Every structure is written in C-alpha cells, then in structure tokens.
Amino acid sequence: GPSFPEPKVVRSQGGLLSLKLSATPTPLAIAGQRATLLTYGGSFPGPTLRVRPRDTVRLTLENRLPEPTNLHWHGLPISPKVDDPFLEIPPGESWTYEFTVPKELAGTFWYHPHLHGRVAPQLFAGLLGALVVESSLDAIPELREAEEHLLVLKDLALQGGRPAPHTPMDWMNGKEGDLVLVNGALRPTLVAQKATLRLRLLNASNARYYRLALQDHPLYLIAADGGFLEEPLEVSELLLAPGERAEVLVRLRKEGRFLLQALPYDRGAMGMMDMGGMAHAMPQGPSRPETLLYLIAPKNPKPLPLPKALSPFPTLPAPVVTRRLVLTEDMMAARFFINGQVFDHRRVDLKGQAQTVEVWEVENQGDMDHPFHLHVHPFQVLSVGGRPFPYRAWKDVVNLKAGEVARLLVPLREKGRTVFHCHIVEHEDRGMMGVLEVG
Ligand SMILES: [Cu+2]
Ligand SMILES: [Cu+2]
Ligand SMILES: [Cu+2]
Ligand SMILES: [Cu+2]
Numbered sequence: 420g421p422s423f424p425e426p427k428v429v430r431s432q433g434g435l436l437s438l439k440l441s442a443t444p445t446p447l448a449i450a451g452q453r454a455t456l457l458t459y460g461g462s463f464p465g466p467t468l469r470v471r472p473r474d475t476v477r478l479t480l481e482n483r484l485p486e487p488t489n490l491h492w493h494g495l496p497i498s499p500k501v502d503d504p505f506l507e508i509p510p511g512e513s514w515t516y517e518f519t520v521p522k523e524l525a526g527t528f529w530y531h532p533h534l535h536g537r538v539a540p541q542l543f544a545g546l547l548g549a550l551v552v553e554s555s556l557d558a559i560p561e562l563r564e565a566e567e568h569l570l571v572l573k574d575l576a577l578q579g580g581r582p583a584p585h586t587p588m589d590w591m592n593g594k595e596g597d598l599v600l601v602n603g604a605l606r607p608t609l610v611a612q613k614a615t616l617r618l619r620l621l622n623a624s625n626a627r628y629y630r631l632a633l634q635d636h637p638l639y640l641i642a643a644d645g646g647f648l649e650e651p652l653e654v655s656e657l658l659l660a661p662g663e664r665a666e667v668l669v670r671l672r673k674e675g676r677f678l679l680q681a682l683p684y685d686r687g688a689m690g691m692m693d694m695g696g697m698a699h700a701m702p703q704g705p706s707r708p709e710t711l712l713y714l715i716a717p718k719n720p721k722p723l724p725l726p727k728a729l730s731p732f733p734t735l736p737a738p739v740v741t742r743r744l745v746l747t748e749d750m751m752a753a754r755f756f757i758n759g760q761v762f763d764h765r766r767v768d769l770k771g772q773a774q775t776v777e778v779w780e781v782e783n784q785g786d787m788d789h790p791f792h793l794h795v796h797p798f799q800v801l802s803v804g805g806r807p808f809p810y811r812a813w814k815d816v817v818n819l820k821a822g823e824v825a826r827l828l829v830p831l832r833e834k835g836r837t838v839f840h841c842h843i844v845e846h847e848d849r850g851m852m853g854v855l856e857v858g
Pocket of ligand 1: 491493531662842
C-alpha cells in the first residue's frame with residue numbers, strides 16, 4: 420500500500436494497551452522472497468506499540484517457539500520484577516507483562532527476547548518490535564507538523580528460507596547479515612510529503628553498526644536512547660550501535676533523490692587467515708557501505724524552523740559511589756568478560772541503593788567495539804574516550820570503541836535484581852553480562 424513500509428501500530432485505548440502477542444515461526448514474504456522467521460504478532464518487525472505516560476500496558480506473550488523465551492522491555496525504567504531478565508516462558512506457555520508507563524518518559528524503546536544463551540539466535544530470526552512513548556512535546560508545531568516515520572534498522576541472512584545458522588565466527592564477532600533492511604524491507608523508497616521529517620531510529624540488529632548519513636543533508640538529533648535532548652543537535656553523521664535509538668529531524672533542502680546510507684565502519688570484527696605458518700586472526704576492516712533507503716524530497720521543500728528547545732534534562736543529586744567495569748575478550752574462545760568474570764545468574768556483582776546516583780566508569784580493554792547496556796536505570800553519558808558528551812539526554816546503551824573509557828551518571832530507580840551486558844547479543848550469550856541488585 421504505502422510506498423514506505425512501517426510496522427503496524429497498536430495504540431493504547433483510554434489509557435490501556437491490552438494485547439496478546441504470540442512468538443511464532445511465521446511464513447512471510449521478505450525482500451522479495453519467502454522465508455520462515457520468528458515473529459511477534461505474525462510480522463517482521465513486530466507491531467509498534469504506541470503509548471503515553473501513565474498508560475497501563477498489559478501484554479500477554481504466548482510462546483509458540485520450540486524453546487523457552489521471554490521479553491525485555493529495552494530502555495523502559497520499570498521494575499525488574501516486571502522486566503524480568505531471568506524469567507523463562509516454556510514452550511506452549513504464556514506470561515502477562517503488566518506495567519505503568521512512567522510519568523517522565525518519552526522516546527523510542529523496543530521489546531525483544533532476553534533468555535541468556537538464546538538471545539542472539541532468537542533476535543536474529545526476527546523477534547523484535549518497537550515501543551513508542553508519545554509526549555506532550557510532540558504537540559509543539561515544529562514537531563507536530565513534521566512527517567513522522569519509524570525506521571527499524573535490522574539486517575538478516577537467509578539459508579534455505581530460514582534465518583542463517585550461527586557459526587563459531589558469528590559467536591565471536593556477533594552475526595551480521597547480507598540483507599540490510601529497514602522495517603523488514605530491502606532499500607524502500609520514502610516519498611516525503613512534507614519538507615521536515617521526524618525519524619525515529621532503532622538499531623535492532625545483533626551486531627551490525629549503522630554509521631548513518633543522508634546525502635547532502637545534516638541530521639538534527641532531538642532524542643537519544645531514552646529521552647529528548649535539551650535542544651536539537653546538528654550532526655553530519657550518526658552512529659547507531661546495536662540496541663541504541665535516536666530521533667532526528669531532517670530538513671529537506673531541495674527537490675531530488677537522496678540516499679540514506681550506512682557508511683563504512685570498522686567495529687573490530689575479525690576473520691581468520693593462513694599464509695604459511697600463520698593461522699591467526701585478522702581484522703575484517705570496515706563494513707561495506709549500504710544504502711538504507713531512497714528519500715524523495717517534495718516539490719519546493721520549505722522545512723519548518725527547528726524547535727528552539729526540547730526538554731530540560733533533570734538536575735541529578737551528587738553521586739555516592741564510583742564503579743569501574745572493565746571489558747575484555749578471549750576472541751578465539753569466543754568468551755567475553757566484565758571485571759574478569761562471565762555471567763552467573765546466581766552471583767550478584769554490584770549492590771546499589773535506590774534513589775542514589777552512581778558514577779560508572781566502563782572501560783573497553785578489548786579490540787572490538789562493545790555497546791554497553793544497563794537495564795532498568797537510564798543513565799547520562801558524561802564522556803567517552805576522554806571527550807565530553809555534547810548533549811544531555813537519557814541513554815541506556817553506550818558504545819565503547821577499543822581502549823575507550825565511558826563515564827556514566829547512573830541514578831538508581833526501581834529496586835530489585837537486574838543485569839548489564841554488551842548489546843552485541845552473541846557476546847551477552849557468551850558471558851559478557853553481570854548482575855546489579857538495587858535495594
Ligand atoms: Cu535490548
Ligand atoms: Cu535492555
Ligand atoms: Cu561485546
Ligand atoms: Cu539486556
């Protein structure tokens with residue numbers, strides 16, 4: 420129908436989003452070919468859930484997979500008793516997630532499986548969808564009058580009409596696929612009807628990075644992972660690591676066709692080489708450039724003025740502890756560590772106090788990029804690689820290139836046991852995850 424494919428939207432009704440969603444192997448048409456994927460709601464991506472603060476969400480997940488699964492409400496600062504990373508929904512069983520959307524929340528979030536050891540294959544097979552929290556700021560004219568679209572960035576590889584299996588190298592690097600899709604479509608065309616576009620961006624890939632650039636145009640960052648910036652930030656490109664989100668304004672400057680591209684980016688993935696007594700790992704180097712979509716500008720584009728301001732970032736109490744988390748790798752074993760340990764669901768690694776603020780220094784001592792994710796407690800990135808972060812906004816995933824230190828301001832919110840881990844999900848399944856208990 421519409422030239423631009425976008426997941427179906429389910430909205431709350433009278434302050435309640437009540438929905439039954441089954442995770443099921445589903446025959447689909449994807450990228451001009453028939454394939455059986457694992458989907459929520461029979462679609463890839465799963466449906467977009469659009470809610471408002473203080474809405475009630477009642478989501479019954481029926482597991483029709485041959486293996487156990489669960490849901491992670493990625494980015495939502497709700498209770499880890501609801502967003503429970505240790506829950507197992509057995510095959511054939513159902514579980515109902517009921518939570519209230521926090522009052523002070525806005526932006527693009529998402530849901531996907533989080534059963535340790537099975538995350539990478541289930542996510543890669545198509546189990547993912549977006550959750551949008553619409554705010555009163557969406558009513559200001561500079562945003563309301565913009566044309567809005569969600570872009571779910573997720574790649575795929577097919578073998579015999581099914582998701583390609585994980586190889587040993589996939590477990591080491593994180594699996595990337597040759598089909599680089601937007602909303603499950605291969606290089607769709609967006610024929611813009613307005614000159615200002617508001618694009619909600621989601622990197623739902625296992626491991627692929629998206630070094631985003633729109634031909635002949637800057638991007639205006641207005642929101643990060645878990646909330647608005649304080650004011651629009653002009654960027655020439657925008658890197659989205661696995662699990663990250665962003666919202667940008669695009670102000671179309673002239674008529675024409677403009678490529679939105681994932682420019683070449685070296686995240687440190689490795690190959691293997693044998694050159695006579697060698698048999699050692701070699702960098703894959705940068706990814707080849709990918710076209711994500713074709714953007715057709717309307718006739719005589721006159722974009723709206725940018726919003727002068729978005730949302731003030733909260734003033735946070737002085738922190739009461741500093742934590743250091745060091746990431747390391749054993750590439751040939753495909754094992755990944757935090758402070759020298761692999762995940763153990765029985766072991767509590769960190770113990771913090773709710774409503775206190777902590778400083779987290781996360782240090783990448785590996786040679787690969789590692790996008791560090793913390794559940795339940797959104798954070799403020801202060802600096803990465805010794806460079807001050809140029810905006811204030813809630814994030815829940817922060818990318819660390821090799822050698823870099825990120826300093827995060829972490830306010831602890833809901834009490835309970837939750838996790839932190841690399842969002843190259845193969846690395847999480849292979850041990851790069853730890854346990855935080857908030858009391
Ligand atoms: Cu996630
Ligand atoms: Cu998460
Ligand atoms: Cu990693
Ligand atoms: Cu997680």
